[PDB]
Amino acid sequence: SVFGKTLCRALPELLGVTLGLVVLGVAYAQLAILLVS
Amino acid sequence: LKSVLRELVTYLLFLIVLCILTYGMMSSNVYYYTRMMSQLFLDTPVSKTEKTNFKTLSSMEDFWKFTEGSLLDGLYWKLLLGVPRIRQLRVRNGSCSIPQDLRDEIKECYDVYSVSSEDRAPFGPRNGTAWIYTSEKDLNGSSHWGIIATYSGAGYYLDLSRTREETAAQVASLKKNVWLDRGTRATFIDFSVYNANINLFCVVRLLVEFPATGGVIPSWQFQPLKLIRYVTTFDFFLAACEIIFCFFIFYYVVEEILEIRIHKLHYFRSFWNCLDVVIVVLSVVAIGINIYRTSNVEVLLQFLEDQNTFPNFEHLAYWQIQFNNIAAVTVFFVWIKLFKFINFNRTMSQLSTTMSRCAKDLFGFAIMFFIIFLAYAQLAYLVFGTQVDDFSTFQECIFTQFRIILGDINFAEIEEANRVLGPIYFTTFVFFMFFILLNMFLAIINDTYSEVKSDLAQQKAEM
Amino acid sequence: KYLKSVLRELVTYLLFLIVLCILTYGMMSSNVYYYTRMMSQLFLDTPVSKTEKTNFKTLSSMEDFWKFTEGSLLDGLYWKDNRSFIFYENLLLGVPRIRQLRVRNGSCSIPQDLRDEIKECYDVYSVSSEDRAPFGPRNGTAWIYTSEKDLNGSSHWGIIATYSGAGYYLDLSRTREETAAQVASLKKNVWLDRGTRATFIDFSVYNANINLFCVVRLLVEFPATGGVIPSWQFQPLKLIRYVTTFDFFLAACEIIFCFFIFYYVVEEILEIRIHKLHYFRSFWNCLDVVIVVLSVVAIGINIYRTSNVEVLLQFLEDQNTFPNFEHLAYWQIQFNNIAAVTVFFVWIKLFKFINFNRTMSQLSTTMSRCAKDLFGFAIMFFIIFLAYAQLAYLVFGTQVDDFSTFQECIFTQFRIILGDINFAEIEEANRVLGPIYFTTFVFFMFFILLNMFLAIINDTYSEVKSDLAQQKAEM
Ligand SMILES: *[C@@H]1O[C@H](CO)[C@@H](O)[C@H](O)[C@H]1NC(C)=O
Numbered sequence: 001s002v003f004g005k006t007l008c009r010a011l012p013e014l015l016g017v018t019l020g021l022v023v024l025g026v027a028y029a030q031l032a033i034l035l036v037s
Numbered sequence: 038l039k040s041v042l043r044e045l046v047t048y049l050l051f052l053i054v055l056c057i058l059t060y061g062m063m064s065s066n067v068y069y070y071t072r073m074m075s076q077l078f079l080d081t082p083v084s085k086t087e088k089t090n091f092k093t094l095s096s097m098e099d100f101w102k103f104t105e106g107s108l109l110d111g112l113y114w115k116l117l118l119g120v121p122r123i124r125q126l127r128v129r130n131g132s133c134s135i136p137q138d139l140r141d142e143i144k145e146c147y148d149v150y151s152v153s154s155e156d157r158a159p160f161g162p163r164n165g166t167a168w169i170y171t172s173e174k175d176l177n178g179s180s181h182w183g184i185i186a187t188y189s190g191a192g193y194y195l196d197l198s199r200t201r202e203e204t205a206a207q208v209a210s211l212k213k214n215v216w217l218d219r220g221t222r223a224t225f226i227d228f229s230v231y232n233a234n235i236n237l238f239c240v241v242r243l244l245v246e247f248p249a250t251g252g253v254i255p256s257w258q259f260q261p262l263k264l265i266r267y268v269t270t271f272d273f274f275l276a277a278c279e280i281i282f283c284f285f286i287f288y289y290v291v292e293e294i295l296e297i298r299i300h301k302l303h304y305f306r307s308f309w310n311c312l313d314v315v316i317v318v319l320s321v322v323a324i325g326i327n328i329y330r331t332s333n334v335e336v337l338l339q340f341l342e343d344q345n346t347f348p349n350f351e352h353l354a355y356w357q358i359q360f361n362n363i364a365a366v367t368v369f370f371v372w373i374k375l376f377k378f379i380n381f382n383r384t385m386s387q388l389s390t391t392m393s394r395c396a397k398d399l400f401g402f403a404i405m406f407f408i409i410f411l412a413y414a415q416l417a418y419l420v421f422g423t424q425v426d427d428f429s430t431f432q433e434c435i436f437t438q439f440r441i442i443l444g445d446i447n448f449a450e451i452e453e454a455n456r457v458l459g460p461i462y463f464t465t466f467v468f469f470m471f472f473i474l475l476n477m478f479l480a481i482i483n484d485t486y487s488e489v490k491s492d493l494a495q496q497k498a499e500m
Numbered sequence: 501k502y503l504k505s506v507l508r509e510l511v512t513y514l515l516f517l518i519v520l521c522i523l524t525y526g527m528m529s530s531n532v533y534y535y536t537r538m539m540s541q542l543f544l545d546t547p548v549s550k551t552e553k554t555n556f557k558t559l560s561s562m563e564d565f566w567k568f569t570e571g572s573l574l575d576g577l578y579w580k581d582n583r584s585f586i587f588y589e590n591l592l593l594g595v596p597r598i599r600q601l602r603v604r605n606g607s608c609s610i611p612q613d614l615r616d617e618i619k620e621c622y623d624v625y626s627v628s629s630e631d632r633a634p635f636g637p638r639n640g641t642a643w644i645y646t647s648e649k650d651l652n653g654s655s656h657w658g659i660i661a662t663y664s665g666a667g668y669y670l671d672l673s674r675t676r677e678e679t680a681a682q683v684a685s686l687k688k689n690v691w692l693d694r695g696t697r698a699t700f701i702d703f704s705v706y707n708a709n710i711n712l713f714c715v716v717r718l719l720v721e722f723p724a725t726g727g728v729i730p731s732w733q734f735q736p737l738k739l740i741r742y743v744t745t746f747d748f749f750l751a752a753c754e755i756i757f758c759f760f761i762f763y764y765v766v767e768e769i770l771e772i773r774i775h776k777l778h779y780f781r782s783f784w785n786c787l788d789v790v791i792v793v794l795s796v797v798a799i800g801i802n803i804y805r806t807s808n809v810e811v812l813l814q815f816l817e818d819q820n821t822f823p824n825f826e827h828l829a830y831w832q833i834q835f836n837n838i839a840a841v842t843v844f845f846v847w848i849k850l851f852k853f854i855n856f857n858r859t860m861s862q863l864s865t866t867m868s869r870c871a872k873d874l875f876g877f878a879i880m881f882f883i884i885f886l887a888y889a890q891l892a893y894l895v896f897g898t899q900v901d902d903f904s905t906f907q908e909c910i911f912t913q914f915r916i917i918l919g920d921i922n923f924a925e926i927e928e929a930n931r932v933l934g935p936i937y938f939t940t941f942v943f944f945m946f947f948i949l950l951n952m953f954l955a956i957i958n959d960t961y962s963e964v965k966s967d968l969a970q971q972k973a974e975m
Pocket residue numbers: 130131144145146
């Protein structure tokens with residue numbers, strides 16, 4: 001019974017990490033374009 | 038705590054201005070023009086009876102055929118903004134020492150290109166300007182930094198005409214009275230075009246270097262520039278965006294100078310205060326070298342060279358690329374600064390502190406990782422240096438090792454080049470950099486996360 | 501005190517590293533790669549003839565070899581009895597030589613059942629089953645056996661087997677017209693029967709501009725099951741030294757390196773006799789022994805390679821013979837391998853001195869207190885790895901070309917982890933037990949077995965961190 005509980009309580013932290021990676025990925029994408037390409 | 042919302046709204050205004058200002062620098066015809074010029078040349082084959090193009094040059098006669106047929110075909114259809122120029126750099130006979138044993142068979146030697154060994158001597162049928170060494174300053178050139186070596190600005194040059202009647206004649210004369218002898222080491226072709234209806238003119242520089250061991254190596258540089266074709270459609274809007282960007286930068290700099298001067302005696306005791314000053318100085322430099330670039334381009338709106346002089350536009354391309362790079366860095370840092378406005382969340386404030394409490398340990402791990410990475414790179418360079426074409430230079434060994442990590446190994450020629458010590462490099466690299474050294478990163482992160490969360494829990498839940 | 505000793509051990513190591521890096525930079529340039537690249541593309545990419553499209557890399561039969569020998573080979577070899585410059589710069593030293601190895605008829609035993617069906621058999625290549633009798637129009641050296649000792653040869657270790665240095669050879673000429681006639685005469689009186697098992701072609705070039713020889717060898721192997729397997733080797737040798745001040749600088753650096761190695765040997769002898777059988781447990785004193793041994797081996801190889809240059813001297817008074825430069829090319833490769841490994845170990849030895857501040861000794865301690873567990877688990881991991889590799893070798897060993905040999909199986913299984921598979925040939929090679937292998941391997945390796953190294957290291961790091969923090973704080 002612990003797998004569902006640990007996948008449900010640890011959802012906000014994973015979502016926050018995903019948000020941070022989305023921001024850090026769009027910044028890197030904007031640097032990648034315009035630099036040489 | 039109301040200034041936080043003021044900073045948030047100011048930063049959002051700045052970000053919306055900057056996003057538009059950088060979307061205005063992603064025109065469709067700045068990249069497609071280069072892609073269509075790099076295919077109009079470099080891909081069309083020689084006149085006939087051959088399939089090799091410039092990208093696959095193989096000999097000297099191939100270069101002569103390309104110069105006669107394909108170059109004089111793509112330049113003239115059936116503007117040039119001045120006239121094309123062709124240049125040669127060569128070395129001196131007897132510039133190296135032939136061993137006494139190998140004599141009576143090898144008379145002359147031509148050393149690899151170097152400034153100390155380059156010759157300054159007249160040619161044979163020496164009536165033109167392409168048979169006398171002119172100094173570096175007299176050619177208005179600086180350097181190229183090619184593949185094999187770096188080439189000076191001097192050499193033997195010949196300005197071409199403006200049509201198929203007074204151009205092919207001198208090229209044929211150069212081929213008849215032999216110009217590219219065994220001593221040649223580099224050949225340059227320089228010209229601008231301005232064949233685009235939109236201003237958007239591009240300069241092109243083609244290099245063909247002859248190594249000291251036979252063969253040819255080609256290289257190319259295509260570089261488009263900018264002009265001010267101001268229209269009421271979208272250009273006044275971008276001018277307003279640029280001037281309001283300058284106003285925003287002025288506001289930011291006066292703000293930061295106010296706080297640094299009037300209180301706290303030192304502004305550089307955090308991370309967000311050592312970042313916005315960097316952004317401000319980069320923006321000031323970008324504005325300066327943008328105004329200067331526009332002023333430089335303004336005067337040269339001539340198109341009346343009348344095939345008398347050769348335009349020299351490399352000085353403008355240098356500033357163009359510098360401005361592009363500095364703007365790319367500025368936009369990236371502006372986007373990074375966004376974290377300050379979302380770090381004070383209920384669940385985002387346990388990962389930021391985790392990643393800031395272990396920065397010293399992460400740097401300490403990165404140094405250890407890079408030492409071993411570079412040791413492996415040097416070993417691969419020494420072992421597979423002359424065969425694999427992936428490990429041909431150190432800068433390519435590093436970039437290949439960074440691609441084995443991303444699951445892009447070839448391994449077809451690594452094992453072919455060396456049956457023993459070829460697999461030993463690969464398997465040990467994988468073992469000691471995927472099982473042992475990429476598990477030392479998450480270990481530090483996990484320990485820091487656990488201790489930070491425990492401290493926060495015993496702090497909040499207790500009080 | 502102790503700082504003086506650390507500085508004494510650090511300055512000498514820095515000087516050693518500087519000397520080693522100077523030598524390594526001097527023994528590797530960028531004009532050496534393009535030399536080999538051009539010489540390779542000249543012979544290995546040009547089609548055998550103006551009409552065909554097969555090159556040396558894709559020979560498929562014994563007639564393609566004769567097309568290549570009277571074709572691309574000569575065109576790329578002679579380039580217009582004056583001397584022949586390959587790219588107008590590469591002088592062709594001496595004359596090329598073509599050699600052959602063959603096994604004798606009746607070297608195996610046909611089963612009695614169909615002995616009236618098949619007449620002759622020729623075994624796979626082996627020294628015990630090699631032909632020695634003359635054959636054909638036994639005029640000269642192309643039809644008469646010549647032993648290894650009388651031919652100045654050595655083994656090769658090709659792809660299928662390890663060939664000796666003997667056989668039936670022939671030295672070609674300096675001009676194209678005579679070489680074409682010689683090869684045509686060899687082709688008329690059939691020189692390549694069913695008994696041939698290998699064929700070698702060797703030559704050399706100089707390129708006096710940058711003083712650097714280049715030795716070229718081409719091998720064609722005819723397996724007992726019919727077919728052709730080609731192989732090549734271009735080696736940029738360097739024999740004539742001391743013509744530039746840079747060469748003298750390198751000689752001085754080599755002497756200094758010898759001095760450093762002698763000093764390190766003396767220091768090792770001084771320290772071993774103190775801690776008898778106790779000296780050999782630090783991983784920093786079990787590593788210096790490796791460096792010393794490798795450096796001594798490299799010094800011996802370099803001396804033995806630069807001292808025996810008799811072949812060059814013998815060739816210098818006779819520029820109309822075959823220059824035998826294969827031994828020098830072999831020892832150059834061996835020296836490069838040894839030097840590369842030695843430099844790698846010397847670079848790794850920086851952790852002796854760099855691990856003297858906090859947050860640098862925590863990582864070293866974490867590595868030191870979990871090495872035993874890592875070795876213990878690597879034993880199990882590699883047992884399972886070898887079991888899977890042997891299963892794949894038994895099931896896919898004759899069809900997939902990635903599991904053709906045991907080593908190929910191991911390397912393919914290492915590449916599967918990175919995410920580099922085909923799986924289009926694995927499935928069609930065996931519809932059952934092919935997918936089972938792949939699925940179970942992926943599950944037991946990515947899910948369960950690679951998640952244990954991380955657990956071990958993560959546990960040990962936290963244990964060490966807590967231990968050090970408790971020791972320091974509670975003092
Ligand atoms: C280069 O100089 C040497 C020096 O004597 C001379 O022998 C040789 O002929 C010269 N090269 C040519 C092409 O004349």
